[PDB]
Design a binder for this molecule. Structure first.
Ligand SMILES: Nc1nc2c(ncn2[C@@H]2O[C@H](COP(=O)(O)OP(=O)(O)NP(=O)(O)O)[C@@H](O)[C@H]2O)c(=O)[nH]1
Ligand SMILES: [K+]
Length: 420
């Protein structure tokens, strides 16, 4: 079932790594020239081979084939040639593969792990570069480890790449069902159309394709009595895996409860963009200064969700319901957001300029370079002398500096340390 792609510029030796691992052609899949993976090789997957019968010239071939790969394949082996380092022609191929939520693994062809010394590869922004010998097959196993690892994260339910999926999560009786039907009744929304894909509500808002994942979970309770939360809770954690934005909805009336932290924590530690919703705010009786007293109340108990918005709204009175889709669309953008490597590093340079780096006992930390590695959430790698020397307090001081530069509200962000 999993389908691996093999993208790059022309003459990087795609076909030499393709014919190494591509087994036998299979002309009963959702089909192209499809090849089952090597029978000798112990992972099982499908090679996709690009052959789309627009414009013909130099630049407008990579457009065509990378697009096809981006659409059908589940993991994408972006492949470069190491015989002269990176090219601006490759940087352009990287720019085409930036427009995709699916994971992309860099392959540096014809080098050692040694000759893979150039920061230019990391700058492309698909994480660790993996060196290969297309002649000898060296370094191909560790590569396919990085490919196969992403098979346990491949969705069972898929949509068009332009579609954005999300979920509403919360305890028993907080208005998730009411909230959604208000958002459907909403002015700007249009709907769509048995069982297999009759579980998620597919609407459009501002001519943008949108999926609410597991409306079936809303619709279950209504035909079924409450045996336990433990089933709804885990059915929500299943939806978060499929989703990209988690709309973590509280009840304004009772306030925050132990169990709220459980379902939200998972979304943070899943890495998804979080947008908190305080429903039933009509039923909250207000004074001069209570709504901000409710926020500062939220930020103690949810101190792992700082980056998230907090809204207040109501499904009954229809107050601030219009705010919901806006906040989502924002979280999606920030969650998907990819940054430019020159700009990033200047922010990192600026970061040290203000606050001196950590001292240990003479040997001070130095930051050499910094690159974004993947999106959703946006993940960064700071290159230093000593990864152990960069402490978390400094590590997130860089987050806040990076958040200042490119916004980031809605998304969490990953910072890593590598060396050498
Ligand atoms: N006053 C007020 N009541 C609300 C609001 N939103 C929902 N409710 C009430 O909250 C009750 C329970 O929430 P419901 O709409 O079923 O959504 P739910 O939290 O998904 N139910 P479940 O937990 O079983 O999935 C409903 O009977 C509804 O009338 C609101 O904005 N204001
Ligand atoms: K270097």
């Amino acid at each position: 079932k999993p389908v691996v792609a093999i993208v790059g510029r022309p003459n990087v030796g795609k076909s030499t790594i393709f014919n190494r691992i591509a087994g036998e052609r299979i002309s009963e899949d959702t089909p192209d020239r499809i090849y089952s993976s090597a029978e000798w090789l112990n992972y099982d997957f499908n090679l996709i081979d690009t052959g789309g019968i627009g414009d013909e010239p130099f630049l407008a071939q990579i457009r065509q084939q990378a697009e096809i790969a981006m659409d059908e394949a589940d993991v994408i082996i972006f492949m470069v040639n190491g015989r002269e380092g990176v090219t601006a022609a490759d940087e352009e191929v990287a720019k085409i593969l930036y427009r995709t939520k699916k994971p992309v693994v860099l392959a540096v062809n014809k080098l050692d792990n040694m000759r893979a010394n150039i920061y230019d590869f990391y700058s492309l922004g698909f994480g660790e570069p993996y060196p290969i010998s297309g002649t000898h097959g060296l370094g191909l196993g560790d590569l396919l480890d990085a490919v196969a690892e992403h098979f346990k994260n491949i969705p069972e339910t898929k949509y068009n790449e332009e579609v954005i999926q999300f979920c509403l999560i919360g305890r028993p009786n907080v208005g998730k069902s009411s909230l959604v039907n208000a958002m459907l009744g909403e002015e700007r929304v249009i709907v769509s159309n048995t069982t297999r894909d009759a579980v998620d509500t597919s609407f459009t808002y501002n001519q943008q394709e949108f999926v609410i994942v597991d409306t079936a979970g809303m619709r279950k309770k209504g035909k079924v009595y409450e045996t336990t939360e433990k089933y709804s809770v885990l059915r929500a954690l299943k939806a978060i895996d499929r989703s990209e934005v988690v709309a973590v909805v509280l009840d304004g009336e009772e306030g925050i409860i132990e169990q709220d932290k459980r379902i939200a924590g998972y979304a943070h530690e899943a890495g998804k963009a979080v947008v908190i919703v305080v429903n039933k705010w009509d039923a909250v009786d207000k004074d001069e200064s209570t709504m901000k007293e409710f926020e500062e109340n939220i930020r103690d108990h949810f101190q792992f969700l700082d980056y998230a918005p907090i809204l207040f709204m109501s499904a009954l009175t229809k107050k601030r319901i219009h705010t919901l889709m806006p906040a989502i669309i924002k979280a999606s953008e920030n969650h998907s957001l990819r940054v430019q490597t020159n700009v990033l590093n200047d922010v990192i340079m600026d970061a040290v300029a203000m606050n001196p780096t950590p001292t240990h006992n003479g040997s001070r930390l130095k930051i050499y370079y910094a690159t974004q590695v993947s999106v959703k959430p946006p993940s960064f790698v700071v290159f230093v002398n000593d990864p152990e020397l960069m402490h978390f307090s400094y590590e997130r001081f860089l987050e806040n500096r990076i958040r200042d530069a490119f916004g980031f509200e809605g998304t969490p962000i990953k910072i890593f340390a590598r060396a050498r």
